């Protein structure tokens, strides 16, 4: 169900995400596959609404943060990268696990892209005073959904399937 | 439902073919992934020909799982579908993760075989399938019924990775 029903939800109720749910989101992230099992992820968890609202300024497409009770900033540590070529993929897998787990827990979430847009990456580095080795990846805003639902939109397209050869 | 915890990289498979219905479900799962701009840039080559699958193992030094796999899915992205080309690898990674999770859900084993951005691997996949310039190899996923490995929970949680409010 969660693969079909997971949606980008950008509008939230007032109430906080339970600490037990926050932990489950982070556990889900850390179960992602990673190149070389390098597990390069670090996470900043925000519940301070003043700071979440400020964080909404990191990009032009991050307005969901203005009502979010929770934000999770996904970062990768260069020093942990055995296979630096594929760190974005590791982080994307972790992000997708968070999104799916959020839907499982009846939460709404949306992936707010950062890497590799320089102005976004720079904003996140500055906002969190990040060391040179700590690379911003994305922000996930999370809350209980307002009006929007985790409901199935059927995106299947058989034209994307090539049998044996392109 | 414990699929996020139990999904493992499975690199050795039984000879049993993956049922047509399960193949379709894997591809459906891929296509439900989020994507920047909703650009949905993905294309898939599905292989069940064992000679072609074995040949495909040569694309990388880390693709030996294909030598026993009854199914391979090559993930590709089309430049001409990209509205936000800066993020296409992320879209494709989300699709790959959906495949892997759906595989575990269906009692299958799978492993992500990285390609992009390793030039030799991408070049080998382009050549093997004679791809158009705009069709970019992303990865290969080998899939089958597990031989001597399991989808089981290896707990990778590390609380030191969690920073509260600030780094
Ligand atoms: C981007 C990426 C590329 C990967 N490439 C390979 C690969 O080429 N060959 C391989 O055997 N495993 C590959 N893996 C699988 C990882 O080695 C595996 O996820 C890691 O060892 C953790 O084990 P798990 O998947 O069981 O959690 C890749 C994983 C990721 C996310
Ligand atoms: C790499 C990536 C970056 C994204 N960046 C943003 C973003 O900055 N702001 C936003 O509102 N949504 C963002 N999204 C969410 C997409 O717009 C969304 O996945 C797409 O419209 C499909 O809708 P769905 O998630 O409901 O399936 C991003 C998604 C991906 C995978």
From TrEMBL, chain B:
Limits of the Nitroreductase domain: 4-79
Pfam families given in the database record: Nitroreductase
GO terms for MF: nucleotide binding; oxidoreductase activity
Binding residue positions for FMN: 7-9, 11, 35, 62, 114, 156
Coiled-coil ranges (or none): none
Gene3D superfamilies, per the entry: NADH Oxidase
Keywords in alphabetical order: Flavoprotein, FMN, Nucleotide-binding
Matches recorded under CDD domains: nitroreductase
Top-level taxon of the source organism: Bacteria
Entry annotated with the keyword Phosphoprotein: no
Protein's UniProt keywords contain Disulfide bond: no
Protein name: Nitroreductase family protein
